[PDB]
Chains A and B, each alone.
With several copies, the nearest count.
Chain A
Amino acid sequence: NYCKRTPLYIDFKEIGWDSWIIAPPGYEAYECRGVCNYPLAEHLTPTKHAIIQALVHLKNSQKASKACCVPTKLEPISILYLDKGVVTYKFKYEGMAVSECGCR
């Protein structure tokens, strides 16, 4: 399938982060999976290098790999975390949730 944003729920307990993440128990971090086949669609904001690299991959796969589907804009979440045993509230935990995917 093509490069798009896929739902991905992270359970902090199952990655060992619940030791310091009091709340929430988890969150929808989403995930950018899918192939970046040429032509690279504009809604995936592909850079000129990604477009060029996708063109060389078509010429022969050995010289250049295909452009990859990766998150392009990340959104913060609000967490309750232990600060030396003290439950503190962090409003914006940056770089946690995916809002926009793309081909780079």
Chain B
Amino acid sequence: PLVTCTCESPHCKGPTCRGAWCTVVLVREEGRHPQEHRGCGNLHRELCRGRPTEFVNHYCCDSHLCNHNVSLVLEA
């Protein structure tokens, strides 16, 4: 079964998306400000289990619109 998720990423063809789980990915490159991506996830569920680092944080959930307005924090 799938779930509807908030889509706020460059690969979003609409405000919502349907996937196996909802994702919030907080990514920080070496130079610029961290960007917060929201969307769904169907492959590589193991990304959700990664401990937050200084550069990446993976949040995942499978409730309806559970990834909406969820703020993540990176490691120092």
Contacts and interface: CB of A to CB of B under 8 A. Distances in A.
Interface of A: 2, 14-20, 37-39, 41-43, 48, 51, 55, 58-61, 81
Contacts of A42: 41-43
Contact of B27 (A18, A43, A58, A81): A58
Interface string B35-76: 001000111101101111111100000000000000000000
User: Is the contact region of chain A dominated by helix, strand, or loop, or is it mixed?
Assistant: helix
A38 B47 CA distance: 12
Contacts of B10: 2
B11 A51 contact: no
B22 interface: no
A15 B75 CA distance: 12
Q: What 4 pairs across the A-B complex have the smallest Cβ distances?
A: A16-B50, A16-B51, A58-B55, A41-B11
Given A2-B10, A39-B37, A51-B47, A16 B56 contact: yes
A24 to B, nearest CB: 16
Interface in B4-54: 9-11, 23, 25, 27-30, 37, 41-44, 46-47, 49-54
Given A17-B49, A51-B47, 20 more contacts: A2-B10, A2-B11, A14-B53, A15-B50, A16-B56, A17-B51, A20-B49, A20-B50, A38-B56, A39-B23, A39-B25, A39-B37, A39-B47, A41-B9, A42-B42, A55-B56, A58-B27, A58-B28, A58-B30, A59-B54
Contacts of A43: 11
